[PDB]
């Protein structure tokens with residue numbers, strides 16, 4: 001119940017899971033707290049300690065703005081931080097099976113939240129079910145989000161950019177140096193993440209600094225080529241300056257803009273983060289990854305195109321209704337509390353909200369490609385069309401393009417299409433299989449019959465957990481024992497993908513082909 005790590009001993013706690021035991025080490029520090037002079041800088045290595053560190057509760061989550069569009073609504077607030085916000089937030093968690101394993105594959109979770117929100121302590125990121133059921137070690141870490149983790153003065157070490165990614169990376173190296181002491185295999189490490197977490201995984205595939213720190217990768221509903229996932233260097237500087245003016249920290253000396261920003265209280269920086277862009281969207285990522293020249297040596301789309309990335313297996317997928325969640329965060333005529341039937345002119349107003357700096361021709365072209373109904377007076381035509389627009393553009397098509405280009409360099413890739421809507425999903429039914437709601441199935445929450453899930457959901461989560469574990473351990477996401485449909489590799493010509501649902505799991509081909517040709521080839525030109 002105590003483990004000797006390279007910086008000192010840590011005490012865990014035992015947990016009862018499915019008539020068995022999991023040992024949890026919650027809140028192990030992995031860097032110097034980035035306070036004072038250290039704010040905005042790369043994480044600094046941790047100094048030794050002589051005590052026994054009590055790792056028996058989740059640590060502080062990183063400073064971040066909270067979603068307030070639905071106070072008291074579980075569908076919204078299940079994603080909000082469940083620990084104190086603090087700048088002192090660079091901690092990580094470890095779930096090891098009991099008895100202590102000998103050479104367990106390690107699954108490392110990177111949460112999403114648009115690079116502005118999120119925390120490893122969320123209920124749906126609870127790794128004990130994976131450790132219990134599959135004998136893997138689950139690691140998850142908190143990394144800085146928002147401007148505190150991604151403010152960029154390119155080249156300037158006082159705020160070089162990508163600090164949150166380097167937090168992630170320092171946690172990956174912690175697993176390299178220490179996880180063997182917990183019974184894990186540092187040579188069998190699988191990164192997996194969702195949305196901005198998945199985009200982070202994809203950038204670890206491109207970052208040479210991370211190539212020795214993991215084996216395989218799983219990308220759930222996200223990838224770096226998504227329009228929200230990388231900030232340009234023009235955007236980053238225009239945004240760092242706008243933050244400076246709004247905080248009164250404008251200086252000619254660029255580094256003393258940073259020291260001025262470093263004496264502002266965390267809340268003042270959080271308050272101004274939303275205004276650094278003239279017109280935001282429910283998908284704005286005002287402070288995200290940048291081509292810093294350190295974690296990212298070049299524009300990542302070039303690295304992908306020219307095969308500059310860690311050669312290994314990837315598992316990639318999206319959900320059926322990625323876009324709908326964002327519609328009730330700004331689009332007119334929409335509400336989680338009615339069926340959100342919108343008109344043609346509401347749809348058109350919706351495009352202006354999601355594509356504010358887009359020529360009127362571009363917005364007409366989106367409308368044209370999405371509004372030739374197979375039946376022209378289905379009243380929900382425009383409602384579904386806007387969701388599919390936001391989903392295809394922001395998640396599904398970038399994930400498919402990532403998988404194609406990555407697979408074109410010889411590595412096995414597996415693509416899934418998650419299309420099960422959770423029986424307990426607090427959001428309305430018109431929103432469907434929403435962004436983020438495969439996670440609980442991946443983490444095995446339906447395996448606990450105590451908690452309101454159908455038996456079909458238990459079976460689906462059991463299979464997904466097995467597939468994810470086999471992918472991490474073996475590089476092949478098959479369920480070999482229960483006569484399951486085999487999951488074929490995704491190759492650039494046939495582009496087979498596996499659908500994940502409770503009734504029938506099927507092999508299909510060329511997901512959203514005609515929609516993605518619009519977004520991937522034509523729309524980048526407008």
Ligand SMILES: *[C@@H]1O[C@H](CO[C@@H]2O[C@@H](C)[C@@H](O)[C@@H](O)[C@@H]2O)[C@@H](O[C@@H]2O[C@H](CO)[C@@H](O)[C@H](O)[C@H]2NC(C)=O)[C@H](O)[C@H]1NC(C)=O
Nearest residue numbers: 234235238239241242243244245246274275276277278279
């Ligand atoms: C780049 O930054 C300028 C400055 O943004 C303004 O000031 C910030 C502190 C913040 O409050 C923003 O919301 C402000 O708009 C942007 O220039 C502004 O652009 C808007 C719309 O184009 C215009 O109404 C303002 O008058 C402009 N203000 C100034 C001083 O020029 C600019 O749009 C930003 N983006 C780009 C791509 O250049």
Ligand SMILES: *[C@@H]1O[C@H](CO[C@@H]2O[C@@H](C)[C@@H](O)[C@@H](O)[C@@H]2O)[C@@H](O[C@@H]2O[C@H](CO)[C@@H](O)[C@H](O)[C@H]2NC(C)=O)[C@H](O)[C@H]1NC(C)=O
Nearest residue numbers: 330331332333334335336337338339340341342343346349
């Ligand atoms: C669905 O609801 C939206 C949102 O309206 C809010 O939520 C409702 C459940 C109800 O409590 C309203 O009083 C709230 O204001 C409706 O959008 C509004 O529609 C009216 C009339 O069309 C308009 O005056 C408001 O500006 C709209 N609000 C917006 C666009 O944000 C929508 O009409 C409802 N649709 C259906 C089919 O019920």
Ligand SMILES: CCCC[N+](C)(C)[C@@H](Cc1c[nH]c2ccccc12)C(=O)NCCC1CCCCCC1
Nearest residue numbers: 075113114195228281282283284325329330435436
């Ligand atoms: C207009 C309000 C802006 C909201 N802001 C920019 C903070 C984003 C920040 C953001 C969060 N997740 C992202 C993914 C991509 C790009 C940006 C974001 C956001 O809270 N949206 C809500 C979507 C999520 C919550 C609803 C429940 C299901 C999960 C989806």
Ligand SMILES: *[C@@H]1O[C@H](CO[C@@H]2O[C@@H](C)[C@@H](O)[C@@H](O)[C@@H]2O)[C@@H](O)[C@H](O)[C@H]1NC(C)=O
Nearest residue numbers: 001010011012013051052053054055056057
């Ligand atoms: C660290 O924890 C030590 C062990 O205490 C254990 O955890 C607490 C919550 C009780 O349940 C106790 O019975 C357990 O054995 C403490 O003795 C020690 O004081 C703690 N140190 C710090 C700095 O918190």
Ligand SMILES: *[C@@H]1O[C@H](CO)[C@@H](O)[C@H](O)[C@H]1NC(C)=O
Nearest residue numbers: 102103104184185186187188
């Ligand atoms: C764990 O497995 C690796 C190969 O994947 C091996 O090199 C290492 O020695 C093993 N460690 C054990 C069994 O403790």
Ligand SMILES: *[C@@H]1O[C@H](CO)[C@@H](O)[C@H](O)[C@H]1NC(C)=O
Nearest residue numbers: 251252253254255256257259
């Ligand atoms: C001001 O800028 C110069 C470079 O132009 C830099 O060397 C110096 O350190 C800055 N001032 C302070 C107090 O750091």
Ligand SMILES: *[C@@H]1O[C@H](CO)[C@@H](O)[C@H](O)[C@H]1NC(C)=O
Nearest residue numbers: 459462463466467479481482
């Ligand atoms: C396979 O089926 C058995 C029942 O025969 C069930 O107990 C087990 O959980 C299933 N495993 C997976 C990975 O689906």
